[PDB]
Amino acid sequence: KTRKESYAIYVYKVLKQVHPDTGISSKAMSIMNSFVNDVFERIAGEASRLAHYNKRSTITSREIQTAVRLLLPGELAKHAVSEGTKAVTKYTSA
Amino acid sequence: KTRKESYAIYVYKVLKQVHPDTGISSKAMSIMNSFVNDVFERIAGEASRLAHYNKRSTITSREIQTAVRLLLPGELAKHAVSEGTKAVTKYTSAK
Amino acid sequence: AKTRSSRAGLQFPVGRVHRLLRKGNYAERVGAGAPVYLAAVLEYLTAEILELAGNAARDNKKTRIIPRHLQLAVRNDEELNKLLGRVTIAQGGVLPNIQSVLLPKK
Amino acid sequence: TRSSRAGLQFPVGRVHRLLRKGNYAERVGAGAPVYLAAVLEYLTAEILELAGNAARDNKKTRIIPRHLQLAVRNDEELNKLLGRVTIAQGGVLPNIQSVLLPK
Amino acid sequence: RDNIQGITKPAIRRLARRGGVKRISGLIYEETRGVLKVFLENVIRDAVTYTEHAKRKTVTAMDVVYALKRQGRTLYGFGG
Amino acid sequence: KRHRKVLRDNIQGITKPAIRRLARRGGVKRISGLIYEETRGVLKVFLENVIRDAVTYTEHAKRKTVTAMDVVYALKRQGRTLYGFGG
Amino acid sequence: PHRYRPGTVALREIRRYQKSTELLIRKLPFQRLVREIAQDFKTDLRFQSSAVMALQEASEAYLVALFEDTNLCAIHAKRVTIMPKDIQLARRIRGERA
Amino acid sequence: KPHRYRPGTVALREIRRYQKSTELLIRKLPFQRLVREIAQDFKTDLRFQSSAVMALQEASEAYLVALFEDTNLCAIHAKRVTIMPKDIQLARRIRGERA
DNA sequence: ATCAATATCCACCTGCAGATTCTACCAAAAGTGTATTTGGAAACTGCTCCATCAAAAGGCATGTTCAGCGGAATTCCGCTGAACATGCCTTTTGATGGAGCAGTTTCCAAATACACTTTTGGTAGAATCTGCAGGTGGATATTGAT
DNA sequence: ATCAATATCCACCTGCAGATTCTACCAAAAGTGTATTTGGAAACTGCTCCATCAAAAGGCATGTTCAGCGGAATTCCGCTGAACATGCCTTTTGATGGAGCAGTTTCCAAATACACTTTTGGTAGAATCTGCAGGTGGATATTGAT
């Protein structure tokens, strides 16, 4: 009963793109799940403060972007931003 | 022009209660206002997560109490809890 | 009409605190007792720091509490020091303290 | 699905739901979950990429916690990002202060 | 025999080794035990506080995870 | 349009005497001659990190002026909460 | 009548334990400690086994890292053997401060 | 032969003097230029509320004074009374500002 | 132990920047009084998984010997503190243009709100599969006594 | 500069704990189509306060001399920890009732939503207030030479 959601399957898909012939133990998958949850919370948290500071009721991709710039190290942020911008674009183009 | 609020008048009422003849500079008052907001945020934040962890959509005096216990050191937590409980109990005894 | 603060026997604003809790996006709902309890804790902590700050002020023969008195009260109190362990009080300076080995002589 | 529209493996729909149920803001725009899902996917690819190499560099095809630790701590930025994180069963990087070596 | 003494010299020595320590003073073992006790008291105090808030008689892994996180000791591998 | 400044080498404005005074408040009795430059480097890194975040908040708000609150928020992000400036 | 010189086996252990990831404190002894300390905050408590493990992973990772800082302090003082004052200095600078 | 305090005496006097006061120890204008220079390298055409500059100086000095305390403990640990670059580096390393 | 050059303490005195104290408009606040919704405490319960326990497994407590590290003692080069002369540049008091933060109103692109159709990720007992931990053999490097 | 004792490596083997695979079930999601609501961008502009030019002057930075004493290098031995063979007791492993962690249904005390009425904290600003910064002079140390 009461299903527990996790990013296990989506993490598995990404693994196959990067290393088609590589597996991952259960304990390793659990760590990855913690990682995605942790980062989601840190980014959402910063974005939350950003909207509040600027008296905005909405968290848009703009807040997510600034949050990423605040949270991630130099290069990692650069690519995360480009990946994010790319996904929003591909998305707006139906 | 957009009214900016602060806990100033309240900090001042409590100051007169503990030290009737002592004043406070504007800079010290500014620090006190930062203190109150800071602790407000920390307590509210602990209460927020606490509610989410327990799949509750309501922050009641109970999450506030647990947050105070998680946040304040030993003796400060004991007294904050009594005052909090005392205030809720009295507030409740009224209509 | 009696304010929720007087109904609680508090100096701190219960209505204001309730409002701040709602617009801070902490939870979908905020109970009635929540802001009462929080306002009380806030009042209790400011009373605690002002009691000690006012004492530091009189110790220094001053009638007006300034930032340095706030810092002296906080850093000389174990628990307040711990609660404000990562906080910087502007214009508070530091506590007088010289390491033993630095003192002159034998 | 929204993820397919964005060209992502990570669940946009779910991310959206999580943002909303997390009380981060009164409202959440449509683009926020897309951008966020993509960032989460990229960071995931990055660690798996380096962790996989660690498994290979160790003659193993299955990624274990050990491999995640090696990949994170040997990478300046990931190490920084996870500077206050403890990866269970990760161990530490082999490192001996020179002054402690024989001779 | 006290439980804290259950944390043996060889165990503390192995920990120091992983930490890259070559030689240890005899006074380290008691020092380490005391340090570990304070660490556990702080983390467990908070974990138990989460347990009681949830009205459980059992300390869950999540209680510990939440405790470690608020202590700035985020742990990956046991949920959240 | 109008003027010419170009700011350069301002780290040298953090003088030896200023650094000595800070060390004294910190309880230091004797100072190696190499400390001054080492301190300038440390201060520079500290300021770059806080200003980087503060300016990031400024831009996000579409402003051209860095506010005390931008700095206050930046300091809190880095765990250096500051009281006294609206924070 | 073979015998390795002082430090040779120590150095061997460093290499051996920095290679592996298993817990170094014995399970049962750690569990008793956890339970004892918890009995002080709330009586009659139960522990999910995964709760005790998370506690041991966190505790060990904490001590191992503290031992690294302690070693740097010993070396700062031109020694190669860690002493309590080294641990004390490390914790004081960490904010676990005294 | 003219009065002269012994080495260390004035230093101890200065420690007592500054631990008793709270005024900023770095010259105001020079600190402000440094802030402007660093910020400018990050983003051109910025303006600063004067209180933003003062907030930066209060935080910067509190950070440095506390770093010098830790540094002092590191020097004393090595049987010295003179702080050196390595004491600062050890302190920052244990602080996790480097590790 | 007496001295003299100096810094520290300090209660008094005062001109004033900064604080306590109105009189007044007041709009965002907070309290009052029904109406409609609903979160989650409470009682009952199936079923994981936790505590207890007995038997198989192997790490640790204990004493001896001495290698080599820590700490004391001694020495001295030259770093770094104290004092001093000189004069720069920060500080201070002000006026002023105007950049740009910020208040106010018009208004539409976008988000909330159901309502309902589609499909998906998680749960679960079943059966099949497989990376690699661990054990074995033998070659080879490392360490340490001649 | 020999070999003698051990630890370390590499190649190969294989039993199995944990990973992988096909399947039927389905409540919870997620996608979609529709009528309604609204946050916040845009355009205009009041008005705060940031940048800056100017001038006067003393607090404080700079640069130098001189030598006190601190850091660093060296010698060294007493003694504390490292290494190790030896006897075995605490931990570990796998088995079994049962305590609670959860899944589910009931239902009401309490939290929205909302149209008013009213008490109030903020504030722009003329004003008399007042704690104490800061200069002054004189009494108790605090230092350091002798």
Q: Is the CB of C4 under 7 A from strand I?
A: yes
Contacts of the segment F15-18: beta carbons below 8 A, 24+ positions apart: F15/H27, F15/H30, F18/H25, F18/H26, F18/H27
- Tokens (6 digits) for A43: 């980014």
Strands D86-87, F65-66: pairing is: unpaired
Range of the domain at G60: 1-98
Q: Are B27 and H22 in contact (CB under 8 A)?
A: no
DSSP structural state of residue A72: S
- Tokens (6 digits) for C47: 């009373």
- Tokens (6 digits) for G19: 């290679």
- DSSP per residue over F54-74, as a string? HHHHHHHTT-SEE-HHHHHHH
Q: Are G98 and G91 in contact (CB under 8 A)?
A: yes
- Tokens (6 digits) for E4: 């804290």
Q: Give which of E15, C10, E61 is closest to G68, Cα–Cα.
A: E15
Residue matched to tokens 């509210």: B44
| Contacts with D93 (C-beta within 8 Å, 6 or more apart), sequence order | D70, D73, D74, G18
Strands G81-82, F81-83: pairing is: unpaired
Dihedral sign for Cα atoms in the order G31, G32, G33, G36: positive
- DSSP per residue over C60-106, as a string? TT-SEE-HHHHHHHHHTSHHHHHHTTTEEETT--------GGGSS--
C-alpha span between C12 and C43 (Å, rounded) = 6
C-alpha span between C55 and C58 (Å, rounded) = 5
Give chain G as a 3 state SS string. Answer: CCCCCCCHHHHHHHHHHHHCCCCCCCHHHHHHHHHHHHHCCCCCCEECHHHHHHHHHHHHHHHHHHHHHHHHHHHHCCCCEECHHHHHHHHHHHCCCC
Amino acid in position D88: A
Question: What phi, psi does A85 have (nearest 5°)?
Answer: -60, -40
What residues are paired with G81 via a beta bridge?
Answer: E23
C-alpha span between G78 and A51 (Å, rounded) = 52
Task: Let me know if A63 is exposed, middle or buried by CB neighbors in 10 A (0-12, 13-18, 19+).
Answer: buried
- Tokens (6 digits) for C75: 């850093």
Residue matched to tokens 């192995």: E14
Amino acid in position D96: I
Mutate to test the interface with D, among C22, C25, C28 (most CBs of D within 10 A): C25
| Contacts with E19 (C-beta within 8 Å, 6 or more apart), sequence order | D92, G63, G64, G65, G66, G67, G68, G70, G71
Question: What phi, psi does C33 have (nearest 5°)?
Answer: -75, -20
CA E59 → C1' I125, Å? 30
C-alpha span between C68 and C55 (Å, rounded) = 12
Give D29-69 as a 3 state SS string. Answer: CCHHHHHHHHHHHHHHHHHHHHHHHHHHCCCCCEECHHHHH
C-alpha span between B82 and B87 (Å, rounded) = 8
Q: Give which of B12, B40, B83 is closest to C54, Cα–Cα.
A: B12
How many CB atoms are located within 10 Å of the residue G63 CB? 25
- DSSP per residue over B28-48, as a string? HHHHHHHHHHHHHHHHHHHHH
- This structure's resolution (Å) is 2.2
CA distances H91 to A26, E38, F26, F52, G76, Å, are 39, 23, 14, 24, 11
Q: Are D78 and D50 in contact (CB under 8 A)?
A: yes
Amino acid in position F80: R
DSSP structural state of residue E5: G
CA distances E69 to B49, C28, E46, G42, Å, are 12, 24, 10, 21
C-alpha span between D61 and D50 (Å, rounded) = 13
CA distances H66 to B64, F73, H34, H40, H88, Å, are 34, 21, 21, 28, 11
Q: Are G49 and D75 in contact (CB under 8 A)?
A: no
Question: In chain C, how many domains are there?
Answer: 1
CA distances D92 to D53, D67, E16, G22, G64, Å, are 17, 11, 12, 11, 9
C-alpha span between G79 and G74 (Å, rounded) = 5
SS3 assignment, position H55: helix
- Tokens (6 digits) for C43: 């009042």
Q: Do D86 and G11 touch (CB under 8 A)?
A: no
What is the domain partition of chain E in residue ranges? 1-80
C-alpha span between C25 and D25 (Å, rounded) = 6
Burial A26-55 (b: 16+ CB within 10 A, else e): ebbbbbbbbbbbbbbbbbbebbbbbbbeee
C-alpha span between G68 and D73 (Å, rounded) = 15
CA atoms within 13 A on the CB side of H43: 19
CA distances B65 to B70, C8, C30, D69, E11, Å, are 9, 16, 14, 38, 39
CA C45 to chain centre: 5
SS3 assignment, position F47: helix
C-alpha span between A39 and A76 (Å, rounded) = 13
Amino acid in position G36: E
C-alpha span between D11 and D3 (Å, rounded) = 6
Q: Give which of G37, G31, G96 is closest to G63, Cα–Cα.
A: G96
The phi-psi region of residue F51 (left if phi > 0; otherwise alpha if psi is between -120 and 50; otherwise beta) is alpha
C-alpha span between A41 and D39 (Å, rounded) = 13
Question: What phi, psi does H48 have (nearest 5°)?
Answer: -130, 135
Q: Is the CB of B66 under 7 A from strand J?
A: no
CA C19 → C1' J113, Å? 16
C-alpha span between A75 and A52 (Å, rounded) = 27
Q: Give which of A11, D95, E5 is closest to G25, Cα–Cα.
A: E5
Q: Are E79 and A43 in contact (CB under 8 A)?
A: no
Q: Where are the alpha helices (DSSP H) in chain F?
A: 16-25, 35-60, 68-77
Q: Give which of F82, F67, F52, F51 is closest to H52, Cα–Cα.
A: F67
Range of the domain at D77: 1-103
The CATH number of the structural domain formed by F1-87 is: 1.10.20.10
Q: Are H70 and H86 in contact (CB under 8 A)?
A: no
Q: Is the CB of G8 under 7 A from strand J?
A: yes
Provide the experimental method for this PDB entry.
Answer: X-ray
- Tokens (6 digits) for B46: 């602990």
Task: Work out the angle at residue C3's Cα, subtended by the Cα atoms of residues C2 and C9, and round it to the nearest 5 degrees.
Answer: 100
- Tokens (6 digits) for A20: 């088609």
Chain E stretch 37-66, residues whose beta carbon is closer than 8 A to a beta carbon of chain B:
46, 49-50, 52-54, 62, 66
- Tokens (6 digits) for D88: 């269970």
CA atoms within 13 A on the CB side of D49: 10
In this complex, is the C-beta atom of C63 within 8 Å of any C-beta atom belonging to chain H?
A: no
3-state helix, strand, coil in chain B (%, to 5): 75, 5, 25
- Protein fold of E1-80: Histone, subunit A (1.10.20)
Q: Are A24 and C1 in contact (CB under 8 A)?
A: no
What residues are paired with C98 via a beta bridge?
Answer: none
Structural domains present in chain A: 1-94 (1.10.20.10)
Amino acid in position B27: K
Q: Are H35 and H48 in contact (CB under 8 A)?
A: yes
DSSP structural state of residue B49: H
- Tokens (6 digits) for H77: 């640990």
To which H or E segment does residue D87 belong?
A: strand D86-87
- Name chain F's partners: 3 or more CB pairs within 8 A: A, B, C, H
Question: In chain H, how many domains are there?
Answer: 1
Subset of residues 84-103 in chain D with CB less than 7 angstroms from any atom in strand I: 102
Residue matched to tokens 């948290």: A45
- DSSP per residue over B70-92, as a string? HHS-HHHHHHHHHHHHHHHHHHH
Q: Are E35 and E41 in contact (CB under 8 A)?
A: no
- Tokens (6 digits) for G52: 């005790």
- Tokens (6 digits) for C80: 């307040």
C-alpha span between E42 and B70 (Å, rounded) = 10
CA atoms within 13 A on the CB side of C37: 27
Nucleotides of J under 7 A from a protein CB: 5-8, 18-20, 28-32, 39-41, 49-53, 60-62, 68-72, 80-85, 90-92, 99-104, 110-112, 118-124, 131-133, 143-146
C-alpha span between F70 and F74 (Å, rounded) = 6
Q: Give which of B8, G43, G50 is closest to E52, Cα–Cα.
A: G43
How many CB atoms are located within 10 Å of the residue H21 CB? 13
Please tell me which residue lies nearest to nucleotide I111, judged from CA to C1': D29
CATH code for position D53: 1.10.20.10
Contacts of E80 in chain A (CB under 8 A): 34, 37-38
Q: Are C38 and B6 in contact (CB under 8 A)?
A: no
Residue matched to tokens 């848009």: A60
Count of all residues that appear for chain E in the document: 80
Q: Are B44 and D23 in contact (CB under 8 A)?
A: no
Q: Give which of C76, C70, A48, A44 is closest to B41, Cα–Cα.
A: A48
C-alpha span between D11 and D37 (Å, rounded) = 7
CA nearest to H79 within chain C:
C101
Largest CA distance in chain A: 49
Subset of residues 37-76 in chain G with CB less than 7 angstroms from any atom in strand J: 44, 46
Amino acid in position A54: N
Q: Is the CB of C13 under 7 A from strand I?
A: yes
C-alpha span between E44 and E3 (Å, rounded) = 16
Residue matched to tokens 């130099």: A74
CA distances H96 to C85, F83, G50, H93, H99, Å, are 17, 24, 29, 5, 5
Q: Are F64 and H47 in contact (CB under 8 A)?
A: yes
C-alpha span between G72 and G80 (Å, rounded) = 9
For chain E, the C-alpha Rg in angstroms (whole number) is 15
- Tokens (6 digits) for E3: 């439980």
| Contacts with E29 (C-beta within 8 Å, 6 or more apart), sequence order | E9, E12
How many CB atoms are located within 10 Å of the residue E79 CB? 19
Q: Do F73 and A54 touch (CB under 8 A)?
A: no
Question: What phi, psi does E75 have (nearest 5°)?
Answer: -120, 130
Residue matched to tokens 């990855």: A32
Q: Are A20 and F44 in contact (CB under 8 A)?
A: no
Which among D8, D32, D65 has the least Cβ separation from residue A59? D32
SS3 assignment, position H63: helix
